[PDB]
Amino acid sequence: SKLKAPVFTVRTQGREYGEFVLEPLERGFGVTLGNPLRRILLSSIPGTAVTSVYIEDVLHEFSTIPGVKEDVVEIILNLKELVVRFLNPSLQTVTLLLKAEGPKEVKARDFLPVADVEIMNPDLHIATLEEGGRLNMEVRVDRGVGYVPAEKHGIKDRINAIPVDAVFSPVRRVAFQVEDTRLGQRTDLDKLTLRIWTDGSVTPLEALNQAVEILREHLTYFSNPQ
Template identity: 45%
Template sequence: MQYDLLSETVSIRTVSENEKEGVFEIEGLYTGYGATVGNALRRVLLSSLPGAAITQVKLKGASHEFTAVPGVIEDMVEIMLNLKRIRFRLNTNEPQVLSIRKKGEGEVLASDIDVNPSVEVITPDHHIATVTEKGAEFDMEITVEQGLGYVPAEVRRSEKLPIGVIALDAIFSPVIKVHTHVENMRVGDRTDYDRLRITVETSGSISPSQALHQSTKILQDHFIKLSEVEVKEAKPSVKSSSSKKEKDSDESLAPKKKSTKSKK
């Protein structure tokens, strides 16, 4: 029976794509490789692509995350939750400190963030807070950084932040959702090859096709590196060897039991 793990008919095509969602099909995969390739791509897409997020915030009048902010409907916890959902595109690896300053009543949106040429707000209409008093002043500083995956606030709290600065859980991944589906297809005389359909949803800071390409490149680089590594035979550790000697020594020193014969 003939088989070909990497068929010449392997191809990828775009079924549909817009700024935030794309559907792609990889065809001609050997039996079982649809799930293998799909699972690998899904894990890399969700955890290994760089993105930008707010990592810490400082709001005038709020000393900690459980503070009620004067003249604002939302408390600090709600404001922090709103900040986590803002999406950015960062064109530098350096942390960027940005400000939001608004006087008088009204809604505070992500578009009110005073950005610089290195930062772009992908979700400008996202709600942050609501100021209810005419004389109130909303004065906030946020830090936007590049990172991978998800970093909890506890990690940043251990860095001894200045008084008044509150750490946020940071969701850096630009990919929001990935779905894979595998079905059979015909290759030559065989009908048990795999077709992998993969749906990628992003925040808009990166296109779905770019996300898929970067994930493929990350996997490729890892496998190329592994293929160049010489596999060496594992040698027994010194500890295990010495512990065996000690065991043998203990057994030789242990008193031997005398065998007794029963008398008839």
């Protein structure tokens, strides 16, 4: 009377969005599977983020730089959009140096290349410099999971360095849907659709595989009593 094994179908477009359908499932197992994966996807997938920024002649985050349209906050907001992928597993922290002179539209590609460091979005806009404006940055990129506010980590490399909220999670959004499906005379079956948005550093398929593996590993912890 046990249900047949479900079929895992994938609908992945590009490298930043994908839909994954598992059907048919026993009654209630769409919720049983969807929620744990969503919690892991939004908090546990390893990733990289900007955790500290140093800008010359800048004292606090709520100031501005003469010679650029964007104030410190807007550039910090643009830096939180930066997606970077480490090509070395042993690599833990890098610093990216940016020296640009106006009149220039500073992009993510203007960052100095670092060995085994890949900028996934080199077209990301950073700042717009007018003539005579000098922009010197040293941004610190760490490795982590989930979302860490700047105050809860407070990472500063040098004096006057501004901690920035670290969006470590490569997954940008998870939405799972459970629909009623049938197989013959059984009508309480579940159809689970998992939709994952990712920044592109990892595939939504890879994020799902990592989330499943994390949940599998935690299930092995219910062994060796006491």
